Each structure stands twice: as structure tokens, then as C-alpha cells.
Subunit: 97 residues, 6 copies
């Protein structure tokens, strides 16, 4: 409801989004190369090495998935806060498994 | 526009969402096991045996699909009404085929 | 922020959505038949030969993807403007490759 | 060892070949359309509606499998006997499930 | 029956094997990259740029297919003759489409 | 040519067959679960825990591959010797990677 409450909820949703991707990618119904690639996309995003548009483009290619029109703006508004909250990307990845 | 109008529109969208899943799963371009599994997820959701977060987690795994950040909150706001409107889950499934 | 600003942003997002579909479909990690089919869906949509609901239904089938509850309303609000802006659908397709 | 013994062994192998195809196709890890199509190929072959080369060509397409250079000659030498031994193709299919 | 008759039959089978691979790869149920790759394997084999063991290893990887124990020796005995018979590999490929 | 020479050649072919399966399964274009499953099939076969017919049935299911009529008899004639030659199945698997 407040801007602050909205921000915090977006952050939690975005954590859940990235951690689900890792869980899916790491499930072993998936190719070992895909899993490493999704882990690396998520880590680079979290480390600020890539930005939302390029992460989503590469993700759709990696998973052979279809585009989501609200996904980039969601990420763009959540990532600055989540990043400040997520000082160790490797540990986040490890924790999502 | 009104809260009531928004609610009704969410319900119709959510019906269309679940009925599309069934149609896709039942098309015969899909594995017979997947189809039975998606039917069972949809029925359990509609019967209140599972909730939105767990349904979506299992669905992404079943279809090997990618996460949708707005999907859980969409479902959470639509399902209470749709459920009261959908007294027979088996008939809903049957009707979506 | 203004209605006009919102409209223009929706149009750009929708261009990016359709052009990403074409890029994905044309990448050569995909079946030649799928690519031709996605190109044809996108062109028909842009030419007003099909509408948002039918385009999305057919797309989910073609790519064996999962439904997106906010996708149809997104398209419905963006397409009238994008269409007036996109007088040559073949050139749009060609440009997205 | 004798020609007669070789013939009988080829027939049993060919029964096992066609019944395995049916079992695989009917397992529900497969698309419902594929299963119906493989069942129909096997039945037509057994009923003499199609011959070995055309059956194998269509099968490779249906299962998206790779060619087997010894498969056609195997089938050609086994099928005349197996067919005389297999007066009801529907029952064979049913039995292999 | 004679060695000469056996040789000629092996050659025809091997032509049919390689031409089927091309037909399958070129059908458009397949990825554009796979098709180009299978075409290139077949051409290199026919041009003597690669030998039977390496062609089959790469093919199994490209099509994600399973190994065939009699395939290499089949190819090894057929290829020397087929190659002398097949002075233009590009035309063979073109003809198999 | 001699029975002894034929036996030794069958053994080498069968080693190459099983080691290729492991290489394919371990390439990381494959699901982590598939790889573990193919490794376990190959080890059980080599350890005499399963026999040729059951190994091939399970393999076709695991890789969603098509049946090979000459595969079981090939394995049956090769395995007794290869097994006596292959005192450590884990090391064979490890070596094929």
C-alpha cells in the first residue's frame, strides 16, 4: 500500500523469482549446461554485471521460453533494493538449492 | 473500474487461465502423464487442496516453464471468488476440453 | 505517468515483445516450421487479421508455452496504436532479425 | 543355425521390436498423437497396408529418430512369416500394453 | 550374394542412410542449426574430410541419438566405393531434399 | 575372421558402445537425472546385476530412443568376455569421461 510497503513486496517477489529460477535450473530435469548458465545469469544480474533487459533476453534464449512484457519493468524496480540486500550472490544461489 | 467490476474481471481471466492450461495439456502434443498432472493441479487448486504458491511451483516444474512474478498475486485475488463459483472441479475440467 | 505517456510506453513494450518473439523464433535453435508459424502469427496480428486472444492461444500452442494472464489485456491496449505506427508488417519482421 | 531356426528367431525378434515400439509409444512419457501414430504405423505394417521402407521412413519422422541401416532388411525378411502368424493386428497392439 | 553384389548393395544402403539423414534434418521439424550441422557432417564424410568413427560420434551428439554398434563397420565398408561414386557432395545433399 | 578374432572385436565394439553412452549421457547437453540413470544402467550391466534385454528396454525408455533389433544379441555375445575383462565398473565409467 505505501510506496515503502510496495518496494519491500517487490523485493520479496523478486527474490522468489530468482530463487525459483535457480531451483528449476538445478532440479536435474534440466541440462547441466543450462543450469550453469542460468546460475551465471542470476549471479551476474545480482552483481550488477548485467542489466534487466539483457538478462531477460538471454534467459528466454537459455530456457527457450516466451517473453513476458511486465518482467523487465518488475526487475528494474526491484533489483536496486535487492542488490543492496544481497551482498553475496554466490551464497544466494547456494541458498536457493 | 469499480472494485466489484475488477473482481469479476479477475475471475473471468482466471477461468480462462486455468481452462487454457487444461486445453494445452489435453491437446495431445503433450505427454499423457503431463496432462494428467496438470489436470490434477488445476483440480486441487480449485478444490482448495493446494494454494497459489505451491500450485505455481509445481506447474513450472511440470511444464518445465519459467516463473511469472505477477501470477501468484493474480491467482490469490481471483481464486476465492472463482472457487465459490465453481462448485464442481471435475465438470470445469471436462468443460475445458 | 500521463495517459499519453503510458500509451507510448505500452507501444514500445509491445514492439519489443513482438520483435523478441521473432528473434527467438528465427534463432535457429528452433524448428523451421515454428519460425514460419510465429512470423505468420505476428504478421497477422499486426495486419489486424487476428485479434489478441486468438493470437495468444495459438502462440502458446506453437511454442508449447504456458499462459500469461496479463498478456491479452496488454496487447489489447497497445495494438491499436502500434498498428497505426506499423504500416508494413513484413518490414517489421525483417527488421527484427 | 538352420534356415528354419534363423527364420523363427527373426520372427521373434521382430515381434519384440514392434511390441517394444508400442510399449514405448504408449508409456505416457510420449505425446498422445505420437502414440496413436506409432500404433497406426505398426498396424498398417502388420496388415500389409505399408511396406518396410515406408514404415521405417515414417517412423524415424514420427519419433524424430535416426536411421538404422540393417532395420529394413531385418523387417523384410521377418514380416512375411510374422504376418501369417499375426492374423489380428489390433489384438497384437492391445497385447503389447 | 557374391562379394561384388554385397558391395553394391552396401553402397545403395549407405546412400539411402545418408540421404535419409539429410531429409530428416531438412524437414523443418528440426532446428535450423541441426540441419546445417548434419548437412556438414554428411558432406565432410563424403568428401573424406572425416572418417566413420568421428562422423558417428558427432552425429549422435548432434541429434542426441543413441549409439549403433553395427553402424561404423557398415559405413567403413561402404564409404570407399560410395565416395568414388559420389564426385559432388553438394549435389548429393541437394538431391536428397 | 577366426571365432577368437570375432570375439575380441565384439568386445572392443561393446566397450566403445557402453563408453559412448556414458560420454553422451555425461555431456551436459543432457538432464542430470538421465546421466545418473544411464551410468547406473551401464554399471549394473557390467556388474551382472541386469541382463541385456532388460538393460536395453530401460535404456530406450531413459533416452526416449527407438529399438535396435541387433542390439541385444550383440550385447549377449560380448558381455561375458567384457565383464571378465572389466573387473571395476566404476573405474570404466570414470574412464569414459
Amino acid at each position: 500500500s505505501s510506496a515503502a510497503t510496495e518496494t519491500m513486496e517487490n523485493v520479496k517477489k523478486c527474490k522468489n523469482f530468482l530463487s525459483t529460477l535457480i531451483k528449476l535450473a538445478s532440479s536435474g530435469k534440466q541440462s547441466t549446461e543450462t543450469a550453469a548458465n542460468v546460475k551465471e545469469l542470476v549471479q551476474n544480474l545480482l552483481d550488477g554485471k548485467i542489466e534487466a533487459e539483457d538478462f531477460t533476453s538471454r534467459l528466454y534464449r537459455e530456457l527457450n521460453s516466451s517473453p513476458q512484457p511486465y518482467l523487465v519493468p518488475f526487475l528494474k524496480r526491484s533489483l536496486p533494493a535487492l542488490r543492496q540486500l544481497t551482498p553475496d550472490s554466490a551464497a544466494f544461489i547456494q541458498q536457493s538449492q
